[PDB]
Amino acid sequence: LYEEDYKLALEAFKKVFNALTHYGAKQAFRSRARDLVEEIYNSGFIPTFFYIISKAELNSDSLDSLISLFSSDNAILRGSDENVSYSAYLFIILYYLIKRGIIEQKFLIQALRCEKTRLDLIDKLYNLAPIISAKIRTYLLAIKRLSEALI
Amino acid sequence: PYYAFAEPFFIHAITHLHVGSGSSVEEEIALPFQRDELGYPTIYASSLKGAIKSFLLKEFPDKRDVIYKVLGEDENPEEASLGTFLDAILFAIPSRIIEIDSAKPYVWVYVTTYELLKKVKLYLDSISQLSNASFSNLKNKIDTILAKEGKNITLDSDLKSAILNEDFYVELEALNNKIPSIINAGVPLLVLEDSIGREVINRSLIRVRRIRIDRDKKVVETGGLWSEEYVPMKTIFFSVLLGKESKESAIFASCILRNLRYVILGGKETIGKGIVELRWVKD
Amino acid sequence: PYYAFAEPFFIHAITHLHVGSGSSVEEEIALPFQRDELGYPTIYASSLKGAIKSFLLKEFPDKRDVIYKVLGEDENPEEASLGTFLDAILFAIPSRIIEIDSAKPYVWVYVTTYELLKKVKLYLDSISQLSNASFSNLKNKIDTILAKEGKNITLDSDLKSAILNEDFYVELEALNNKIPSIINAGVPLLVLEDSIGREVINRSLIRVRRIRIDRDKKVVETGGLWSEEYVPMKTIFFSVLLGKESKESAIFASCILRNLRYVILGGKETIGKGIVELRWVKDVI
Amino acid sequence: PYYAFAEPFFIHAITHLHVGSGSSVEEEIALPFQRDELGYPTIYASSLKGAIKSFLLKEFPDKRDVIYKVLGEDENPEEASLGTFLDAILFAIPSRIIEIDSAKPYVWVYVTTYELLKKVKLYLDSISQLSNASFSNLKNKIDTILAKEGKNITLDSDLKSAILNEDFYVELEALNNKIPSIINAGVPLLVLEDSIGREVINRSLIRVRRIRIDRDKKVVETGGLWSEEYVPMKTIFFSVLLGKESKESAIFASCILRNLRYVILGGKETIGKGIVELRWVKDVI
Amino acid sequence: STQREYVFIPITNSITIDVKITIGGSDHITNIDERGIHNVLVITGYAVDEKNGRLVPTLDPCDYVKGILVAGTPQQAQSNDFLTLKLPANKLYLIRKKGNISDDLKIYIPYSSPDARNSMKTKPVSISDDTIVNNIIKEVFDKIYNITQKEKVKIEKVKEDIKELFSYYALEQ
Amino acid sequence: STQREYVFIPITNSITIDVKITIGGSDHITNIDERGIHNVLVITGYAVDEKNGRLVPTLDPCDYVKGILVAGTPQQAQSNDFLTLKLPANKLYLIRKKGNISDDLKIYIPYSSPDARNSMKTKPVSISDDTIVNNIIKEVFDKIYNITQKEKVKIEKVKEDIKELFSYYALEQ
Amino acid sequence: STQREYVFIPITNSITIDVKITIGGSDHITNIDERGIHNVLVITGYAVDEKNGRLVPTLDPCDYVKGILVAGTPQQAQSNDFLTLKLPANKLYLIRKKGNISDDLKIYIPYSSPDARNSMKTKPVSISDDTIVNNIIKEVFDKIYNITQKEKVKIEKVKEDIKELFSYYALEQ
Amino acid sequence: STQREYVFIPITNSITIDVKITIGGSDHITNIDERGIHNVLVITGYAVDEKNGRLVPTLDPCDYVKGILVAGTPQQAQSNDFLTLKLPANKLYLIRKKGNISDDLKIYIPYSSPDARNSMKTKPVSISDDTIVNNIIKEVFDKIYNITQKEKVKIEKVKEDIKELFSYYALEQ
């Protein structure tokens, strides 16, 4: 069932290893990798998601310094402490969510463009949290093992 | 005459089971289960008959001659046994369910594929209108279910959706409105598409590593590590006992088979891996 | 009687215990606990047998032949063992509680679900036929509890409302306020429905971050960090010990099994995990 | 006996003490304290063993082999460790008091609960069987206290009422006309009902906001603000050190454990946290 | 107090006059629980006569007689031919089991001296022609079943299970 | 010293006249405290001989007898036919160990000799025929524990535990 | 005929003059068959009174006395202090069985009354101090089994096997 | 019988003649087996002496001396100044065990009376100063183990284990 997720990680990730440079918030990503996973199933998906969006800088910088990844190239994501190194992770999860038709782009792109629809974007993620948590599990453990090996 | 009457029965696992096969597969397990042609867990008729015969010889030592006649003789085995077991085929395996819907709480569910039910119907059609014991309702139920092959069907439920074995989302649909349950354990049955059903099933099996520890310095001995595969508790198999007409076959069916609930199948019994409850389809 | 003696017993955790899982399953925890078919924690009787045997071979250094007969020779076996261990079912786990309207509150309570009780009833009914041992007390008490299946109940105490493990509000019904303790402890037993029971029990488990530290520079060594799952103190498992007629089994069932009270299970014993107490059901009922 | 030596000890916090749990994101505090299964502070025996072993390895640079044999090797473990640490149970926590009905002015006081005492009794019962040692004095002290369950009691005074940690009124009773108490600090020990004791002990912990300042502009850094939890100084934990028969086990129990008084547990060892005093039950009770 | 008079269930029409008191004790083992009949006692090594039907037996074990077990005290001028005997209620061949039994019973069985003239030849009698099963429901499935036609609306369920399950043996003489 | 005496519970005709001093003072090992019985004693390697019911010493660990431990004396003059001995009261093999054991005890046991005329074939027999249960509650469980009918309308508990627990191996010879 | 008697094996001297029929027939159940001491007997619930070595009946299943069965009769200056018992020979608790045995038996075991004016605390005793192993080989294993010191060449092996096979509980009182 | 003398290994010079010969015992307990030394003995509660260093019996368990056990006897009818003792060899504090030993031994310890004149205050001492480890090679390790240079080429493999295997407590006075 899950055998293209390992293929999806390459062109979803696209860079959370190299252009995450300076080795602080670069190596720190592995803490995301392990902890969040144990966080995502011991504590739930929505608690971890609220935590991740908390660390998001959702102005337009951490709203477009990521939606630029949909289109162009590797995005050196220096910015500041893990808020741009954290909005790439929000991007990771939402990239899985769009490339697997759990939530479509036309909503996502529209949900992150008014701040009126961020709320019901999250309110809809809340209803999809069981299914989402079940489905991303292997797709996440993929990048967790990527981190163990490479990052 | 010549397999006049038959007894189909359910093999309900009371503990885990491990009917072994050597290292007879290409998986990472080193002590796999006995496998069907479809890679599903099966119980060969040799093993089932040997275990049941041994158990009956122990717990009916005066009926040793009747048991010898029905199931064979150690020496002077120039007298064909007038009873036979078919291979036990997996009928349903318990699965962990994270259900999203139905307002009804369930934490585990029975799971089947349509291949399994196809073989069960094969066993079942080859008896009823041929032999004389009549339990056509079970066959009608299995045919009604087999009608819907190619889509995850829930049975006796209102689920409509679930996570199975913590790893697989599936979208279900009731059969028509309602149907008598094929099992009597009040737990939903799900019949799954033969492709996602087998992923769910091969994730329902228990594959453990095991270790031999150095008895003095409490460490593992070198190479004292292997893997084994148990069919989970509550798993159900299905088999039939076919009886050729004779007198002591009636004694078998009357005195003996009516006092067989629990037997020990398979091996690794000191681990406790063999207890089984036999439910005859006669209630 | 397929079995000569049937010795059901409880396994009261004294410290936190950690029987590790053998599995190629990638989990979140680096070292999870052993799981049954419902995801509940369990002890594979492989581990029970290995540990109890390694203990007995030392506590009773003279009777090593009785033990080697009932639990099998080690390095050159010629015969099948005569004793069988059943897998340890979870029976009750402790959970922190906050109550609303009590007389004298509790701060922790015993949590069981109906599925665990059904597995225990399966064991009891299966063994009532493979032996001459008819456990009327356990069986009838567990049947009275199973009558109320599908409704969270407090067995004895009068709680009517609680917050288990700081997260889960639960309403509760008295069974009848007219039923003795399954085990004569001072804590109430909560029989939960299964869906909420799964979450409560997962909260009662203990995940523990651990590290390794460079002795030189008192900083975490690279790679030295992992998580590790424990079962709390006061956790009660259930299992049965079963043996065949041997005259080494009558001894085992009368000399060896009346001097087993404390054993070390699982691993991580250099850090105190594993000390456990056996409570033979024939005594504690 | 399963164990050669069985050395119960008390751990006395000299300064404040911080053994971290590791942070989650359901946390409420960035650096919480290792918690019991029923929600009290504790020291996981992994922390105990690692700290004490690090200490011994540089305090006794000649008994290195004895330490590696009792507390396990570091480089290439080809054998288990004969020594075992149990998880440190909270025995008593210092608590502020405003004592009505007493001209004897106490500023603080020791507080324990019946559940912590039950846990200590379980430790003592278990290691009593698994060893030749016995702790009949300690066991009977604990038992005579535990007999008084249901009512709050005080040991080394006759207060009859108090106000603990500024919020919790209690009404005490006197224990059998001055039962000599375990610890010796001329300050009363109170044994509360666990419901009250839970909140009292929570109010007895120390929460502290810390910050981080940029190194050239004397203003706080972004994100450099967090909370942190300590267990007060003068806090008492109860642990046991168990060893299995060996030559090195005797040298350990007779040469090393007689020169262990002050060790450094936990972290934050530059805020001067974690200095602690081990007081062996055998030579203090 | 209770004792059960086994009443055979043939398609042959001799179950008309064999009982006077309907209830007896307060417990009824052969149940009608909207899923089928229960605890119907089977009698191995026995047969039934096709003329003046009773349990004139063989000793061959392939021959069986299905029949209801329900409390009765026949006529107080018989049971010296309806065989009085006492059972520990665990030696009973009972199909469709759903309860635990008193471990003690008194069974009265219609049975008499077989013959001294002809050899007994056997044949398995089956059921057909649903009117026969309807007469079976008529005869004693109300005379002693004080439950039928009031709650068990699945009359066709009993119809089908009787007509399809109850096979027995007889002599056809 | 504390002086207890062992009485055993077979369905046989031997328990009627064994003891005189049920208590005398206030001493009893076996207790009945709303959890049924406690501290039942088991003596492995022996077997009941209903003909003058006593413990015949065989060498079979699989043979055992269970029964009650009570403070008293054999007939105030016997033990010329009993086996008497004093143990540290922990070497015992007690069932349902709940209450007190005085760390030293001397026990009188009904006893016979092997008397090697027959093979001492032993067969297990458990308590049944609950009117035997009734008159054995009457015989020993009234007088010895005169709390009988005094703390339990739940007599049924200490009624069923007898069949549940007091198994033994007779000689059947 | 089939009349054996059991001789305990301590590390004291109640050893040789207990019997005077060495074989009587030509057999011994515990037969040294040049591949170990086979068919050793184990008696449970008994300890040796090391002073005047004899088995005393305790009630501790953890108390066992190990020794050999030999064909014979005890010394005919004796025979009121022996438990003459007749057993179906499967009831025996033999260890390290090699063959099957007489299937009925008559055994004389050296008895000693409990001496119930004292407490019977017991201790496990192994067999070491090979100065006892020598005169064990001599005082019994050559007399009863002339096969030793006459045919064998691994007398050291059977030495090691009695050293690691015969243990017992002693009263030490 | 076999006897070994506990020849210690200090950094000072008292270890030229602590023997008669390399003859007398069964074999060398302390082996040198191409991994380093094995089965080093460690005497606890004793301290090496300033000059003519032998084992002074303090009572401090924190005091120890590490030495090699070799097959021999000391100095031609000495041992009015030695401790001689038979030991079951399961009482020997042996570090770096490799094989197994005689299970019985006669051990000679160079020993003094404590000389209760000066306060026995001892100091931990380590073998350093390779001009001492080469001296210990030549003067004792070469002689008692000619296996050095007659088996290997690597004597540095034990020149290190001399550093890491023999620390001791000297009286320092």
Which is it for the CA torsion G42, G46, G47, G52, positive or negative? negative
C-alpha G15/C-alpha G138 separation (Å) is 10
DSSP-derived letter for residue H142 is I
At residue H68, what are phi and psi to the nearest 5 degrees? -100, 140
* Residue appearing with tokens 């401090």: H60
Q: Give the three-class secondary structure for B128.
A: coil
Residues A71 and A80: beta-carbon distance below 8 Å: no
Residue F42 CA to residue F61 CA, distance in Å, equals 12
Q: Is the alpha carbon torsion for C185, C186, C188, C194 positive or negative?
A: negative
How many residues are listed for chain A in this entry? 151
Pairing status of strand D88-96 against strand G105-107: unpaired
DSSP letters spanning B235-259 = -EEEEEEEE-S-HHHHHIIIIIGGG
Polymer length of chain D: 285
> Interior CA angle at F92 toward F89 and F94, to 5°?
115
Chain centroid, CA B220 distance in Å = 35
| β-bridge pairing F105-110 and F3-8 | parallel
Chain C interface mutation, best of A23, A27, A38, A145, highest count of C Cβ atoms under 10 Å: A38
User: Structure tokens of G161?
Assistant: 């096997």
Residues paired with residue D5 on neighbouring β-strands, in sequence order: D243
Q: Which two tokens stand for residue C29?
A: 């925890």
Other residues' Cβ atoms within 10 Å of the Cβ of residue B21: 16
DSSP C141: H
Tell me how crowded residue H66 is: count the other CB atoms within 10 A of its CB: 22
Specify the pairing of strand F55-57 against strand F46-48.
antiparallel
Count: domains in chain A:
1
Give one DSSP letter per residue of H51-101, joined into a string: SS--BB----TT-EEEEEEEE--BTTT--TTEEEEEE-SSS--EES--S--
> Within 13 Å, how many C-alpha atoms sit on residue E100's CB side?
0
Residue H101 near residue H89 (C-beta atoms within 8 A): yes
Q: Do chains G and A touch (3 or more CB pairs under 8 A)?
A: no
**Which ranges in B96-195 belong to alpha helices (H)?**
114-125, 136-146
Element (H, E) at G149: none
CA pair distance C195, C201, nearest whole angstrom: 10
Q: What's the token pair of residue E109? A: 């069985």
Cβ atoms of residues G143 and G40 within 8 Å? no
* Pairs across D and H, CB distance < 8 A: 17
Backbone angles phi, psi at B122, to 5 degrees: -55, -50
User: Residue A57: which domain range?
Assistant: 4-150
Q: Tell me the helix, strand and coil percentages in chain E, rounded to 5.
A: 10, 20, 70
Q: Which of G172, G173, G168 is nearest to G64 (CA)?
A: G168
The whole-angstrom distance between G82's CA and the closest CA on chain C is 24
From the number of C-beta atoms within 10 Å of its C-beta (0-12, 13-18, 19+), residue D125 rates as middle
The answer to whether G and C touch (≥3 CB pairs < 8 Å) is yes
Binary contact (D247, H167; C-beta < 8 A): no
Residue C266 near residue C274, CB atoms below 8 Å: yes
Beta carbons of B262 and C129 less than 8 Å apart: yes
Q: Tokens standing for C131?
A: 């032996």
Residues of C with CB under 8 A from a CB of G: 62-63, 65, 247, 250-251, 254-255, 259
Q: Name every chain B residue with its beta carbon within 8 A of the beta carbon of A137.
A: 166-167
What is the rounded CA–CA span in Å between residue D250 and residue D66? 9
Residue E23 tokens, joined:
């209830």
Strands F37-38 vs F40-44: parallel, antiparallel or unpaired:
unpaired
CB atoms within 10 A of CB D194: 23
Within 10 angstroms of residue D111's Cβ, the number of other Cβ atoms is 29
User: Inter-axis angle of helices C114-129 and C194-204, to 10 degrees?
Assistant: 100
- Cα(C45)–Cα(C88) distance, integer angstroms: 7
Query: Contact at 8 Å (CB) between D163 and D100?
Result: yes
Q: Tell me, what amino acid is at B179?
A: I
Residue F93 contacts C, CB cutoff 8 Å:
yes
Contact B96, B234 (CB under 8 A): no
3 state SS for A5-40? HHHHHHHHHCCCCCCCCCCCCCCCHHHHHHHHHHHH
B42-43 vs B88-99, strand pairing mode: antiparallel
User: Minimal Cα–Cα distance from A68 to chain D, Å?
Assistant: 26
The residue type found at C176 is N
Question: Around Cβ B119, how many Cβ atoms within 10 Å?
Answer: 21
- Residue G70 CA to residue G93 CA, distance in Å, equals 15
What method was applied to determine this entry? cryo-EM
- The residue type of G159 is K
CA atoms within 13 A on the CB side of F107: 32
Do residues G56 and G171 lie in contact, with contact meaning Cβ atoms separated by under 8 Å? yes
CA H85-H86-H89 angle, to 5 degrees, is: 120
Q: Over the range D35-63, which residues count as b (16 or more CB within 10 Å of their CB) and which as e? A: ebbbbbbbbbbbbbbbbbbebbbeebeeb
d(CA F62, CA G45): 12
> Which amino acid belongs to residue D188?
P
For B4, phi and psi rounded to 5 degrees?
-65, -65
Report how far residue B250's alpha carbon sits from residue B63's, in angstroms, rounded to the nearest whole number: 13
Residue in the block written with tokens 């004791």: D197
Tokens of F8: 């055993």
Reported for D134-140, long-range contacts at CB under 8 A and 24+ positions apart, including other chains, are D135/D8, D135/D281, D135/D285, D137/D285, D138/D8, D138/D182, D138/D281, D138/D285
Contacts of C182 (CB under 8 A, 6+ apart): C138, C141, C142, C155, C189
Token code pair at residue G121? 């605390």
Spell out the residues 6+ positions from residue G2 whose beta carbon is closer than 8 angstroms to its own. Answer: G102, G104, G105, G106
Nearest to A29 by CA among A73, A87, A70: A87
Cα–Cα distance between D224 and C230 in angstroms, integer? 33
* Phi/psi at G74 (5° precision): -80, 85
Helix spans in F8-151 (H):
130-136, 143
Phi, psi of C137 (to 5 degrees): -70, -60
Q: Could you give the 3-state DSSP secondary structure of residue B179?
A: coil
Task: Name the helix (H) or strand (E) containing A71.
Answer: none
Query: Following CA atoms B194, B195, B197, B199 in sequence, which dihedral angle do they give, to the nearest 10 degrees?
Result: 150
Determine the Cα–Cα distance for residues E71 and E79; give it in Å rounded to an integer: 13
Contact D152, D192 (CB under 8 A): yes
Smallest Cα distance from C199 to chain F, Å: 34
Q: Do D83 and C269 touch (CB under 8 A)?
A: no
Distance in angstroms (rounded) separating the CA atoms of residues E110 and E112: 7
Handedness of CA E121, E127, E131, E135 (dihedral sign): positive
Q: Give the residue among B270, H29, A44 at the shortest CA–CA distance from C69.
A: B270
Could you give the number of structural domains in chain F?
Answer: 1
Domain containing G92 equals 1-173
CA quadruple A49, A50, A56, A58: dihedral sign:
positive
d(CA B236, CA B40): 13
| Closest among A113, A88, A108 to A98, alpha carbons compared | A108
Rounded CA gap, H128 and C23, in Å? Answer: 50
Using CB atoms, pick whichever of F58, F84, F114 lies closest to residue G114: F84
Distance CA F47, CA H150 (A): 73
Buried b or exposed e, range B202-218, using 16+ CB within 10 angstroms = bbbbbbbebbebeeeeb
Half-sphere exposure of C216 (CA within 13 A, CB side): 1
Those of residues 146-185 in D touching chain C at CB distance below 8 A are 150
Residue B85, helix vs strand vs coil:
strand
Cited resolution, angstroms: 2.7
> Where do we find the tokens 């019996």?
H57
Q: Which long-range contacts (CB under 8 A, 24 or more apart) does G45-50 make?
A: G45/F43, G45/F44, G45/F45, G45/F61, G47/G120, G47/G122, G47/G168, G47/G169, G47/G170, G47/G171, G48/G8, G48/G10, G48/G12, G48/G168, G48/G169, G48/G170, G48/G171, G49/G112, G49/G171, G50/G10, G50/G12, G50/G170, G50/G171, G50/G172
The Cα-based distances of B146 to A94, B139, B142, B162, B194 in angstroms read 39, 10, 6, 21, 12
The answer, for C255 touching chain D at a CB cutoff of 8 Å, is: no
CB C234 within 8 A of CB A45: no
Cβ within 8 Å of residue D241, ≥6 positions away: D5, D6, D7, D8, D9, D83, D84, D85, D86, D257
d(CA F132, CA D123): 47
Give bridge partners of residue C12 from the DSSP assignment: C236, C277
DSSP state of D181: P
- List of chain B residues whose C-beta atoms are within 8 Å of the C-beta of residue E160: none
Q: How far is B161 from chain C (nearest CA, A)?
A: 16
Contact in structure between G5 and G107 (CB atoms under 8 Å): yes
Q: How many CB atoms lie within 10 A of CB H81?
A: 13
Q: Which residue type does D77 have?
A: P
- Please name the helix (run of DSSP H) or strand (run of DSSP E) that holds residue C268, with its range, or none: none
- Strands H94-95 and H40-44: what pairing? antiparallel
DSSP reduced 3-state for G110: strand
User: What's the CA gap between C156 and C141, in Å, rounded?
Assistant: 12
Rounded distance between C-alpha atoms, residue C5 and residue B139, angstroms: 42
Distance CA D38, CA C97 (A): 9
Dihedral angle of Cα B255, B256, B259, B260, to the nearest 10 degrees: -170
User: What does the DSSP 8-state code read for residue D256?
Assistant: I
Phi, psi of G29 (to 5 degrees): -65, -55
Find out whether F81 and G52 touch, Cβ atoms under 8 Å: no
Torsion of CA C168, C169, C175, C177, to 10 degrees: 120
What is the 8-class DSSP label of residue C92? E
Q: How far apart are CA C262 and CA D242, in angstroms?
A: 15
Long-range contacts formed by E57-63: CB under 8 A, 24+ apart: E57/E111, E57/E114, E58/E120, E58/E122, E58/E169, E60/B247, E60/E122, E61/B247, E61/B248, E61/B250, E61/B251, E61/B254, E62/B245, E62/B247, E62/B250, E62/E122, E62/E169, E63/E122, E63/E169
Strands of E105-110's sheet in order across: E4-5, E105-110, E82-87
Q: Do C29 and A38 touch (CB under 8 A)?
A: yes
- Are D95 and D108 contacting, i.e. CB atoms less than 8 angstroms apart? yes
Q: What CA–CA distance (Å, rounded) separates B277 from B233? A: 11
With CA atoms as reference, report the closest residue to D93 among D36, D141, D20: D36
Name beta bridge partners: D191.
Answer: D112, D153
User: Rounded distance, CA F153 to CA F159, Å?
Assistant: 11
**H137 phi and psi, to 5 degrees?**
-65, -55
H129 Rama sector, left if φ>0, alpha if ψ -120 to 50, beta otherwise: left
Strands B5-13 and B275-280: antiparallel
How near does any CA of chain F get to the CA of C272, in Å?
Answer: 29
Token pair in block for residue F172:
């059947």
By the 8 A CB rule, do D17 and D31 touch?
Answer: no
Given a contact cutoff of 8 angstroms between Cβ atoms, the answer to whether F155 and F138 are in contact is no
